């Protein structure tokens, strides 16, 4: 009957749909590889989808996926076993090297632009008409690392203009240079800003930005990467 028809029909629809869904999520990181970088033998039942090309705003070109994948940076890791499936140990300092939970991607060395073509993110000093409207204004508060030692002071807030959001704090270190700290990895207390991931001694290692009034996708990744990695790698310095 009709009902039987409809339901049998639907289970068929649903199956090609999953198939669709699945092949679309195969536009990145595929095809698969072996730990040595050579293409893996068994890529699953699903074919790579036919490429699609994205037209990027602000004359920043196009992006076609799937496409040629490459890390575009050295990886300081060495195998710890003779068969597949085991960890790869950092061969240096994971933090400095940017492997592990400290990994960063070779995104573009251009800042993200808003709908109009201006830099999406800005130090608040250069963002005409922006003020802390609620909560504790961090600016001026010392910054404490997981080792409970003071590392610097907030000397500005880097804001997201289109969305009026605090993205990073700009901290000034003992030598007078500054670093950005992701907003999402700091605890704002009433008399200090506490950073659990990094011990005071690692703040200097936080990668620097080439221009003082801009951050690029590459530098966001290298920073967030680094600060995140502290959680696993600063661990010996963290007390509480």
């Amino acid at each position: 009957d009709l009902a039987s028809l409809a339901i049998y029909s639907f289970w068929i629809f649903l199956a090609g749909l999953i198939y669709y869904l699945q092949t679309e999520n195969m536009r990145e990181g595929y095809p698969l590889e072996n730990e040595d970088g050579t293409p893996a033998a068994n890529q699953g039942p699903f074919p790579l989808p036919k490429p699609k090309t994205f037209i990027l705003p602000h004359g920043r070109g196009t992006l076609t996926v799937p496409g040629p994948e490459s890390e575009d940076r050295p990886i300081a890791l060495a195998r710890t076993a003779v068969s597949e499936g085991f960890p790869h140990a950092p061969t240096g300092d994971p933090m400095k090297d940017g492997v592990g939970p400290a990994s960063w991607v070779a995104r573009r060395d251009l800042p993200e632009l808003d709908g109009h073509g201006h830099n999406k993110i800005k130090p608040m000093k250069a963002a005409a008409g922006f003020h802390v409207s609620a909560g504790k204004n961090p600016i001026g508060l010392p910054v404490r690392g997981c080792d409970l030692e003071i590392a610097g002071k907030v000397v500005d807030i880097w804001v997201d203009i289109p969305e009026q959001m605090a993205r990073f704090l700009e901290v000034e270190l003992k030598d007078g240079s500054t670093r950005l700290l992701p907003m999402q990895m700091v605890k704002v207390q009433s008399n200090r800003v506490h950073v659990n991931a990094l011990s005071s001694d690692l703040f200097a290692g936080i990668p620097t930005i080439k221009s003082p009034t801009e951050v690029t996708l590459l530098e966001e990744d290298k920073i967030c990467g680094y600060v995140a990695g502290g959680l696993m790698y600063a661990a010996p310095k963290r007390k509480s």
Partner: protein
Amino acid sequence: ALLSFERKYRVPGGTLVGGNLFDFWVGPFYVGFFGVATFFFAALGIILIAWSAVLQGTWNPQLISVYPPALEYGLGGAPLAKGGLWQIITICATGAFVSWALREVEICRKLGIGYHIPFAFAFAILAYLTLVLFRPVMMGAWGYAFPYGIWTHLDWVSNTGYTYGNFHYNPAHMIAISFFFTNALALALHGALVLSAANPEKGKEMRTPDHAATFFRDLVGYSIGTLGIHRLGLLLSLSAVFFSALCMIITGTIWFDQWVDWWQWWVKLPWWANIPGGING
């Protein structure tokens, strides 16, 4: 075996239990100590379930059903064929679930991300524990739990419901449904919003998050934002499930009568209780 960008992430560490012992992968999958735990609990449980199936004398999945002990057994142990098997199976499920959560924690650490996923999952686990542990204890027999079978479980739902009248009147049930409907609505929108920006009109450039923000302000006069709709989503789902537990944990324990009748409180407020006319006067 690895995604084109996976290797730099596959470093040692992050394990909660047992150091480097189980710190490794099997194909795409991460094992970890709890990798093993869940496997063991999952193996055992499925076994017991098959064992129930022979005692039942059917291999047909639409028929197989593992029932809790009958009320006469209260919160004591029961013979295998008479409810023990379900009790173990329930122990094993719990073991599986919790372990699966703790593995999520272990993966979280290795990758250096927050613990929001394991945390959210714990709500699912807590709803399940409400229906097979918290409510039966409080009620006083394993027998109030739902049976493990594809349709028999739908039956428990239907019977348990109709016991208190039309269950629609359970007030926390009303609230819980609101979150389920609202969440779906919001998942519908979020998905649609991002896709429409990423997949514009033919030949146009990828839209901006700003366009998205604008599209909504134009539509209903407001836009929550990228970090917002994601907090929102998390909130509606967790909430839906939170109220779902609540509506059950109260049912049969502190309220055992017809749910519709509980509304008489409102209608019988002394200031309008006796005023004639309307529906109730």
